[PDB]
Design a protein around this ligand. Sequence first.
Ligand SMILES: Nc1ncnc2c1ncn2[C@@H]1O[C@H](COP(=O)(O)OP(=O)(O)OP(=O)(O)O)[C@@H](O)[C@H]1O
Ligand SMILES: Nc1ncnc2c1ncn2[C@@H]1O[C@H](COP(=O)(O)OP(=O)(O)O)[C@@H](O)[C@H]1O
Lengths: 224, 433, 829
Amino acid sequence: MESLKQIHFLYQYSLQFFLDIYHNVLYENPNTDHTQRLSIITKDLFQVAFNRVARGMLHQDHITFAMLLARIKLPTYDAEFQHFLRGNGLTVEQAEAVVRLSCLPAFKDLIAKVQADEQFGIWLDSSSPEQTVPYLWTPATPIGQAIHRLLLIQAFRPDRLLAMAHMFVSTNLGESFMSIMEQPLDLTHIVGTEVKPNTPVLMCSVPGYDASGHVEDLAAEQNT
Amino acid sequence: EPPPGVKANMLRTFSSIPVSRICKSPNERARLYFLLAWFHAIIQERLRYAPLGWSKKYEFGESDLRSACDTVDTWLDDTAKGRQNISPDKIPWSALKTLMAQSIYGGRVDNEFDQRLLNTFLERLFTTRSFDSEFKLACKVDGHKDIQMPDGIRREEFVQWVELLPDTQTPSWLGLPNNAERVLLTTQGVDMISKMLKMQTLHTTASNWLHLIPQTLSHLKRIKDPLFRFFEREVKMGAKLLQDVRQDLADVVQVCEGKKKQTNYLRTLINELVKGILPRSWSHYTVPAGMTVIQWVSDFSERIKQLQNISLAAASKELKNIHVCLGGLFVPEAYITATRQYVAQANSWSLEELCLEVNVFGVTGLKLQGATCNNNKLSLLPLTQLRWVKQSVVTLPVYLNFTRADLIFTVDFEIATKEDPRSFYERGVAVLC
Amino acid sequence: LGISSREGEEVMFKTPLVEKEMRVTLAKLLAESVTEVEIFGKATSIDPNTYITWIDKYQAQLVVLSAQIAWSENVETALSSAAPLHSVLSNVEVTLNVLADSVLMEQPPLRRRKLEHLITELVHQRDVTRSLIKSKIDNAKSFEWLSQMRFYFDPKQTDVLQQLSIQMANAKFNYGFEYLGVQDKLVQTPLTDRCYLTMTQALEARLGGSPFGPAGTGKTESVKALGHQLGRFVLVFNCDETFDFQAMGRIFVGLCQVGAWGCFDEFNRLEERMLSAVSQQVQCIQEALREHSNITCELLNKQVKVSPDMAIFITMNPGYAGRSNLPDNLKKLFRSLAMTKPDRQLIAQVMLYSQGFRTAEVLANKIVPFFKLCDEQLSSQSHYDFGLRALKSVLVSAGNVKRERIQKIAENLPEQEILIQSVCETMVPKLVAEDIPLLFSLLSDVFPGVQYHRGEMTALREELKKVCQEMYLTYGDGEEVGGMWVEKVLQLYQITQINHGLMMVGPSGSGKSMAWRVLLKALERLEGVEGVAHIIDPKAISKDHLYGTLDPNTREWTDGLFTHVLRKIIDSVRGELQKRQWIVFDGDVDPEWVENLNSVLDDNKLLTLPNGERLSLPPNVRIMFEVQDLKYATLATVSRCGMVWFSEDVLSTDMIFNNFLARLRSIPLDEASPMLQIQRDAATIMQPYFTSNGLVTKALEHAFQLEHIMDLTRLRCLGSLFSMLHQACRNVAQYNANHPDFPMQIEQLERYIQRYLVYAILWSLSGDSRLKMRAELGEYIRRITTVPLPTAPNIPIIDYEVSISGEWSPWQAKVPQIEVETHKVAAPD
Ligand SMILES: Nc1ncnc2c1ncn2[C@@H]1O[C@H](COP(=O)(O)OP(=O)(O)OP(=O)(O)O)[C@@H](O)[C@H]1O
Ligand SMILES: Nc1ncnc2c1ncn2[C@@H]1O[C@H](COP(=O)(O)OP(=O)(O)O)[C@@H](O)[C@H]1O
């Protein structure tokens, strides 16, 4: 979370941020067995950390940092996972992306599979390829599968990559892990919860949108 | 920020609207608010897919929707003050449509094509047919699906209808033909990758780029006709800019070769060249913003070949027959008016009384973005003939660039029968040079 | 007792405080005027023997308002009951026809303005009625009629302020009845209607209206025109950095106290600080008056009563270089509107019919595409404007040329030639030479035939001859050596009659200063009126020095340069108003000071102060800018004023040579005397060189083929040559003084001056260059010159001095090989 500053000038976070996050996720955990408590808090730390971080972040990276939380829900698949960061019939761009993806053993057979799977050729023209991905690649878990699907969509249909990444975040942390953002920020609740006195409330707005109009309504809401 | 997708802004709009206001009767009001909200969402996403969604990136902020709500409230309150129901036909559809197209969401609209496309959408949405249970808000996707307008009469049903929208949204909800993402996300995904990958000599540099430029740009050779004067002026500008830029580049090369000459202007020019940015001193003809020096040199080579051919043909008057490249010239509007004057003189009509017809003066290089045909029946350009004559069609723009920033040449094409002309404005069609 | 109207349309009170008096008088007069104009409303055919009397009995604003009220009542009654609509159309058409026939004949003063006003008003009414008829409306309260500016009058209304009401789309205003004056009426185009619609919306919403777009499309004019259409007095403020947060607060306090309309020209240079503070203030007052609609407001930490009639208006020109962005919390407080292309064809049609041209429709339909074609065609120079301002100026020129031709002679006057004569008056001057072959040819293809030849004020020509001979300048008449320059001088004389505001533009060494000097002196001789000038350099002093500054702690505005010159002018203690008074700016362009003049180079010629003090330009005053080029000027700067392009060929080489010879012959170095005698002799020696090709022009043109350490300009090096030839004459004077009994004769002076002049050209031209370039100019001079030159086969010509005996001498005679003191081997000096 402190390494986020490399991407933006607004991505400055303190240790008090994390102290408050853990204090609330502990004292205000939604639950009384010890193992139950630990599993619930293991999920709830991820959830509350994501919510608090991304409510003060621009949308284009709301997925980004989120997926890095899924980087630390991994048994482990780092050797093939770190490829799509290393490297960055079919079209030239798709051809080179696929040949680069072929470096890993798991997709080493793609050179044959794409030649055999005509339904893959049809899927290349699918409107929502992420929702239905063929598996052209010895057990396999849901999370390892989803990592393979991210790598496949990167190789073939990067236009929908950001969509498929959401599913990867669902494969590890939950489909409802991200659903808390598609709604108006309940400023009353978040202000009463996270904002103690001496904490200045910063409302930063992309140009063309004013934030002040919200808070005045809140001032009308609370009769303050 | 404005949210992503239609559903998010719709839910935010319902959240912002106090329930005490929207709930008040007549019930019709509630539906109209939803309609307004839906429309706003389309606008709020079309901006994200410029220039196809909007040629000019206008802002449509909170105050626009607030004035929209005030306008709708005033119209409906004064229409049937005191009643408990308004018939679908009795809503002042035209009045609200006009106040929408001209002031609120058209006040910031300046280019008449955008003002045309706002009126198109307003005609599509704000009608009596909206109160029909079979009314379709838009086409869902290419696969024979349509967003059916909710038949409820309460926000307690409209809000739920908005929640149950599909996850796999595409621009087709907005009328765009689902292609902005093919670039936009195609960039963002790569950017996303780079972001996590970021989370976990001047003289030699100039010389490498400047060594082969002299082998790229060739060298140019230099009565009262309306055509022969303009092309003489244009090739004069071409030769001037060619000699200036080529001399500057050769002098930079000599600086890199080691023959001193490191003057102030040459120092600045080297500093700009090594970064690959276009020197602002050379911006003598409009180009896309942020264009690189390599793109500039390629365009300059093509323009030099064009003007060399123009000079060789004109020297041989014959400028009605010699081909041209609209947009490949430096001031194409001057060329268009030169053709106007040539037709006016050649057969002795007055200029004010002329108008243009086009079909497939011989001009090449254009390309129709957002439509295609082969019989002047546009459906949702190797050679073009233009003529001027005295005194189921679509009025299209023609822009010099590929960013739709400069309206230069208006055209009126003929569409095929089965296409709604309205769809040609929702699809954001135009012609690029 | 009455009101002393500026134009002459006086007003007399019904009961001969002041604001109530004028409001009551205007209201009762309006009631009488509408009670009279209903006759023409119902009349089948209008006789001018009553129509002109009714027009003369009342004022311009009053007669327009009465006509508007009667037409609105007639249309509404016709819709309530296509027969009656066609009847109303016939009535208004008959009124328009009789008015358009009346304007053909000359009229007394203060009447033709009213006739033009009513022509505009009636064509607007006819357009609305015809549009309503074509899209047939049966319902009285349909939107397509409700959305136009409707007028209603109820005599039952006891108090005399509220009888008239204006109604618009979901809006109801009350006409101010404040005295507005004549000014002029703007043609009602679609975009003006859009402005009225949104502005009315914002006013009913207690907000402000923000027109924006390219400069010079009627933003401030639309605002002020609508203010007149509501009877509200409009105040235009020249916004700029000088306006601190307290100044604008005082302005708002005054606006709220008086309830006027606050027109602002450019909210793009107040800086973010005084922009955000103003945002706070406007939000405060807006909310206060919103509470009033459903009061006191805290302006500058003071509770002040505020009237409901006040309003804020924010003109802007986003997109230009010298402009700043805005906060969003301010932008949400103003209803914005983009204007980019006012419909010019209808404007020209209505204006030409207002003047009464026979074929006004055809003239408009030709002149507007002429503007578009010329703008699309001609070269992309940095000061070419063909927007709405040029169209208005050429139309007013056409009107004045019509009046001049009528006074020269009447009903069969050709009018295409009038348009051609106006275009050549106002559009040809700005053109570059390369743009003359196109433009005239374009006029051939928009106005076939109707060939035109310019007149001439030969009295001015002879006066210019006299002064030009006085000032040792060369004179011509159109095609001689002095032809082009004097022709441009007459062009400037023509332009100053129209554009109260003007720019002489061209590269250095063109004769702009001389041009306006000779014109001022010649006009002074011709009309016998003191031509007084005030020259100001803009950048040589601070902008604050240029305009002045307000102390932050009291009311003491220390005047700047321009403001003090103005204050002296309009004070006119010395009868300055009875003199042709010009303020000439000479320097370069910077918006930071140029766009502070944007309210005094425009139709409403008037600038404002942070204190609120207002200064208008009297009619005699002209503002003139002498400028090299326009690399850093917005479109507003170019559009505000007329142009004169002084190309580099306005002064031929022989022109300056002859001026040098004349100055040499006439005036002495110390003021045939001795100095004068030697001057005339030397001028005689060099006369075959200071003319035509000769040697001096050849060398001067050769000098631009060689490399220089700085930019070679002709006039710099030629002034150098002139000064050092003056020193040659001084040298001869000293020689004669050295022999009081053996003065120099012709046989010596000829050799001396010839060799001196050759050396002078060779050095002064290549005065700043490397050794090889000086040697190259020496070789050129050897090739061209006729004077004998040193015979050394390898010594550069620059390595010889000219002896007072007139003989070349190597410089090695003047370089003694000395041995300095060992005490001072390398000491200073
Ligand atoms: N028509 C003319 N005949 C003779 N000499 C002239 C004429 N016009 C200008 N000159 C001389 O040319 C020289 C430069 O002209 P002038 O003094 O008018 O400069 P200017 O217009 O202010 O120049 P700049 O454009 O460089 O600011 C002066 O010596 C002036 O006397
Ligand atoms: N409808 C019209 N008909 C004729 N002339 C007009 C019309 N509207 C504006 N003009 C002219 O356009 C000019 C520009 O007005 P203005 O809005 O004050 O420019 P800006 O505010 O950009 O400085 C004025 O000089 C006016 O005479």
